[PDB]
Write a protein that binds this ligand. Structure first.
Ligand SMILES: *[C@@H]1O[C@H](CO)[C@@H](O[C@@H]2O[C@H](CO)[C@@H](O[C@@H]3O[C@H](CO[C@H]4O[C@H](CO)[C@@H](O)[C@H](O)[C@@H]4O)[C@@H](O)[C@H](O)[C@@H]3O)[C@H](O)[C@H]2NC(C)=O)[C@H](O)[C@H]1NC(C)=O
Ligand SMILES: *[C@@H]1O[C@H](CO)[C@@H](O)[C@H](O)[C@H]1NC(C)=O
Ligand SMILES: *[C@@H]1O[C@H](CO)[C@@H](O)[C@H](O)[C@H]1NC(C)=O
Ligand SMILES: O[C@H]1[C@H](O)[C@@H](Cl)C=C[C@@H]1O
Ligand SMILES: *[C@H]1CC[C@@H](O)[C@H](O)[C@H]1O
Ligand code: NA
Ligand code: NA
Length: 497
C-alpha cells in the first residue's frame, strides 16, 4: 500500500527508509480468483514484494524449464517464522519515538507487514545484552527464593512482546532459550568460558537448574505470557570450548540426554507448564545426526523431546542431506526447527552491510534448503540492531533485517527483511510442504507449499545473474508462464479449486 523509500549505502541493493511519519507497507495477503495467479517480486534493482497477476493456461508447449507441482506428495507441516527479542533488539526498538516503534513492530507483526508468528526470548542475559545477569544471581540460592525478572524483562522485553501480540492477527508462539545458569551452579563459576553445571544429572545442581526453567515460565505467566516451547540450552557445544567469550553452559550430548531424562523433562512434566514443548540441541546442524541418536535412542529422554532445534552457522560445511535428511530418516516423528540465524558473526563477514542483496539471498536460500529437508520453521536472531550491529557486551556485532538509526529517528528495512517476508507473509502455520520437480538442471532454488485451504504457494529464488524463463505446472489447474529474473525472489500464489 505504501512504497519503499530507497536508500543506497554503497552495497549491492537499497534499504527501505522508515521513520515516525512513514514506512513502506503491504496489503494483507489474499489468493486471487481461480484461473489467475499472483506474483510477488523483489529484485536487487529495488523492487520490494511488488504484486502482479497472470493467467493460468490450460496448455503448455516448449523446451524451457518446467517446475511441476506434486500436490499429493506431502512432507512437513509449517510451524512458522520469526525473530528474537533480545535485550539489544528491545533497546534499539525503544530508542525510537513511539510512532516509529509502532511502524517497526507493524513491519514484522502486522498483516500490513510480514506476519511473523514466532518470537524467541532469551532466558536472562546473552551477548546481545549490555549487562551480564541471570534470574538468580544471589549466591547458593538453591531454593531459588531470590529468583526474579529484572527490568530487562519487565520494562523492555515483556511490554514489547505484548505490543507485538496486539498487532499480530495470527497466533504467536514464544520460544525460550537460556545461555548461562547462575555462576554458583557452574564448574567454572563464570558466565562465559569452559564450564558446565556442577556434578551430574539427577543431582541438586541439575534439579535446581530444571526448577529455574519453571520459575522463568511462572514469572512470564504472571505477566500474561505463555510459551509454545523452550530449548534445553542455547548452543550447548559452546560451553565445551576453552575460552568461550560470552554466556554459555556446556553439555556433551550424553549430558544433555541425562539432564533431559532426569531433571528437565520430569520437572516440566510435573508442572503447570506440562504442555510447553521441549526442543533439544539448539546448536549447529553439523552435530546431527549424532546428537539426535544419543538423546533420542534413550526412551527416558525421548519421551520428553518434541523437536530438534538447529542453528545455521556451520551449514556451509554441513550438507543438509547428511544432517537434516539423515536425522529425519532416523527420527521422522521428531520435528526439526531452525531457531537462530544471522549474517555478520563470521571472521570474514563485516557486522552490518546496509542494503546487501547477498545477505537477503543467504536468508532465502537457507529457508528454502531447510524447507526442502523437513524443517518446520525458521527463526532470525536480533529483531533490530544499531548501525554497528549492537549493542553487545563482548562487541560480537552482527547484522539484522532492521537497522535503527536513533539520531535520525529512522529505521532501515534491509533485503533480509523482504527475503524472510517472501515466506513469512504467505505461509501460515499449518501449511504443508509438497513436491516440486524440475524438468532440467537449473540454477534456481524453489519450494512449494500447500496453504491450509488447499491453495498453492511457491517461492522461487534466482541467485544467478541470468533471467530464467520458466513454467510452473499444477496438474489439476494449468500452467503459469513466468520468468525468474537474475537476483530476484518471487512468491507465487494460486487457488486450486
Ligand atoms: C520520514 O520519511 C519521509 C519519506 O522519506 C520524509 O518525507 C520526504 O521528505 C523529503 C524531503 O522533504 C521529500 O523529498 C523531496 O521530494 C520531492 C519529490 O517528491 C514527491 O515525489 C517523490 C518521488 O520520489 C515521492 O516519493 C513523494 O511522495 C512526493 O510525492 C523533490 O522534488 C524534492 O526536491 C525533495 O527531494 C519527500 O517528498 C518526502 N517523502 C514523502 C513520502 O513524503 C519525511 O520528511 C521523514 N520525516 C522525518 C520526521 O524526518
Ligand atoms: C489445449 O490442448 C487440447 C488437447 O490437445 C486442445 O483440445 C485444445 O484446443 C488446446 N488449446 C486450448 C486453447 O485449450
Ligand atoms: C532472598 O530471599 C529471602 C526470602 O524471601 C529474603 O529473606 C532475602 O532478603 C533475599 N535476599 C536477597 C539478596 O534479596
Ligand atoms: O516485473 C515483472 C516480472 O519480472 C515478470 Cl516475471 C512478470 C510480471 C512483472 O510485472
Ligand atoms: C547465535 C549466534 C550469534 C550469537 O550472537 C548468539 O548468542 C548465538 O547463540
Ligand atoms: Na494477536
Ligand atoms: Na564478523
Amino acid at each position: 500500500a505504501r512504497p519503499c523509500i530507497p536508500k543506497s549505502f554503497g552495497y549491492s541493493s537499497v534499504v527501505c527508509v522508515c521513520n515516525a511519519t512513514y514506512c513502506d507497507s503491504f496489503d494483507p495477503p489474499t489468493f486471487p480468483a481461480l484461473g489467475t495467479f499472483s506474483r510477488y517480486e523483489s529484485t536487487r534493482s529495488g523492487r520490494r514484494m511488488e504484486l502482479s497477476m497472470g493467467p493460468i493456461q490450460a496448455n503448455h508447449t516448449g523446451t524451457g524449464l518446467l517446475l511441476t507441482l506434486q500436490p499429493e506428495q506431502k512432507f512437513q507441516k509449517v510451524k512458522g517464522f520469526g525473530g528474537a527479542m533480545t535485550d539489544a533488539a528491545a533497546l534499539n526498538i525503544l530508542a525510537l519515538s513511539p510512532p516509529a516503534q509502532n511502524l517497526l513492530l507493524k513491519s514484522y507483526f502486522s498483516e500490513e507487514g510480514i506476519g511473523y508468528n514466532i518470537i524467541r526470548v532469551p532466558m536472562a542475559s546473552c551477548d546481545f545484552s549490555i549487562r551480564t545477569y541471570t534470574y538468580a544471581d544471589t549466591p547458593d540460592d538453591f531454593q531459588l527464593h531470590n529468583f526474579s525478572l529484572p527490568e530487562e524483562d519487565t520494562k523492555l522485553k515483556i511490554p514489547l512482546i505484548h505490543r507485538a501480540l496486539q498487532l499480530a492477527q495470527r497466533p504467536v508462539s514464544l520460544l525460550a532459550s537460556p545461555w548461562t545458569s547462575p555462576t554458583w551452579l557452574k564448574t567454572n563459576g563464570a558466565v562465559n568460558g569452559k564450564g558446565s553445571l556442577k556434578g551430574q544429572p539427577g543431582d541438586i545442581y541439575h534439579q535446581t537448574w530444571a526448577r529455574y526453567f519453571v520459575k522463568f515460565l511462572d514469572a512470564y505467566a504472571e505477566h500474561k505470557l505463555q510459551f509454545w516451547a523452550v530449548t534445553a540450552e542455547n548452543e550447548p557445544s559452546a560451553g565445551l570450548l576453552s575460552g568461550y567469550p560470552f554466556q554459555c553452559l556446556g553439555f556433551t550430548p550424553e549430558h544433555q540426554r541425562d539432564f533431559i531424562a532426569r531433571d528437565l523433562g520430569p520437572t516440566l512434566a510435573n508442572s503447570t507448564h506440562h504442555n510447553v514443548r521441549l526442543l533439544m540441541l539448539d546448536d549447529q546442524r553439523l552435530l546431527l545426526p549424532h546428537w539426535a541418536k544419543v538423546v533420542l535412542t534413550d526412551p527416558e529422554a525421548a519421551k520428553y523431546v518434541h523437536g530438534i532445534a538447529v542453528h545455521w552457522y556451520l551449514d556451509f560445511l554441513a550438507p543438509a542431506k547428511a544432517t537434516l535428511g539423515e536425522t529425519h530418516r532416523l527420527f521422522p516423528n521428531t520435528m526439526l526447527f531452525a531457531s537462530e540465524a544471522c549474517v555478520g558473526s563470521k571472521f570474514w563477514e563485516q557486522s552490518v552491510r546496509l542494503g546487501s542483496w547477498d545477505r537477503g539471498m543467504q536468508y532465502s536460500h537457507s529457508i528454502i534448503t531447510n524447507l526442502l529437508y523437513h524443517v518446520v520453521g525458521w527463526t532470525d536472531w536480533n529483531l533490530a540492531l544499531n548501525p554497528e550491529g549492537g549493542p553487545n557486551w563482548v562487541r560480537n556485532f552482527v547484522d539484522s533485517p532492521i537497522i535503527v538509526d536513533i539520531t535520525k529517528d529512522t529505521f532501515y528495512k534491509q533485503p533480509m527483511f523482504y527475503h524472510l517476508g517472501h515466506f513469512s507473509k504467505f505461509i501460515p502455520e499449518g501449511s504443508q510442504r509438497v513436491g516440486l520437480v524440475a524438468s532440467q538442471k537449473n540454477d534456481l532454488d524453489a519450494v512449494a507449499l500447500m496453504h491450509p485451504d488447499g491453495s498453492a504457494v511457491v517461492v522461487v529464488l534466482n541467485r544467478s545473474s541470468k533471467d530464467v524463463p520458466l513454467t510452473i505446472k499444477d496438474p489439476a489447474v494449468g500452467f503459469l508462464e513466468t520468468i525468474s529474473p537474475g537476483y530476484s525472489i518471487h512468491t507465487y500464489l494460486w487457488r486450486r479449486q
